[PDB]
Amino acid sequence: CPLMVKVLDAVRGSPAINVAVHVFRKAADDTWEPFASGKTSESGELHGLTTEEQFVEGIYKVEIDTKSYWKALGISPFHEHAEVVFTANDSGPRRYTIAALLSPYSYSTTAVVT
Amino acid sequence: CPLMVKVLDAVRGSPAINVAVHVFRKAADDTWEPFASGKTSESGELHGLTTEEQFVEGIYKVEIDTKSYWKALGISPFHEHAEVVFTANDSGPRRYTIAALLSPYSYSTTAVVT
């Protein structure tokens, strides 16, 4: 799948399972359309996302519900969510893997394409 | 200052200067209002922001224009910008220091609350 997502937990050294992730597509008008959604797996990964050229180029947004992730634990978090806004589109069909490493007061996001 | 931002460049090992930062305050209606704006200083810092109880309780968004920074450089980044969303004030009027560490395809955001 053209777009994959992976989330890890830096506090426990494990995949961030059961994490909600919504994918928005920047619409015709200045605004955000719901594009895809899922919950991370046992592997902390989300595959079923989108298709080949349902996925076309545009600005996308990956919203990660980190707040819920943390409270589930009993942790006091800082961010409301983790957000990743990218442009899909150079000259190519790629493969986008967005990774996110979660801490209560800190997070990193990285992109790996091919 | 109640709200401070610091931004570093992991590619060059220096403060990220002249990076535009917009601060939004989630308004009465489900929506974002402009609250403060500025650019990072020679030391990668933005202090001019807000004040005492002007800064009120609420959900704010700190949007760092990473895209323009990398472009000015000759680098073609992945992120459109770096967004930081948080609930402020609650159990205290706090002091917020938001740190960002940028790379072309990666960014990390950390918060220091006192």
UniProtKB/Swiss-Prot annotation, chains A, B:
Q: Which UniProt keywords apply?
A: Amyloid, Amyloidosis, Cytoplasm, Disease variant, Gamma-carboxyglutamic acid, Glycoprotein, Hormone, Neuropathy, Phosphoprotein, Secreted, Signal, Sulfation, Thyroid hormone, Transport
Q: Which residues bind L-thyroxine?
A: K6, E45, S108
Q: Which residues carry this modification: Sulfocysteine?
A: C1
Task: Cite a single GO MF annotation.
Answer: protein-containing complex binding
The subcellular location is: Secreted; Cytoplasm
Its biological purpose is as follows: Thyroid hormone-binding protein. Probably transports thyroxine from the bloodstream to the brain.
Protein name, per record: Transthyretin
Q: Which organism is it from?
A: Homo sapiens (Human)
The portion of the full protein included here is 30 to 143 of 147
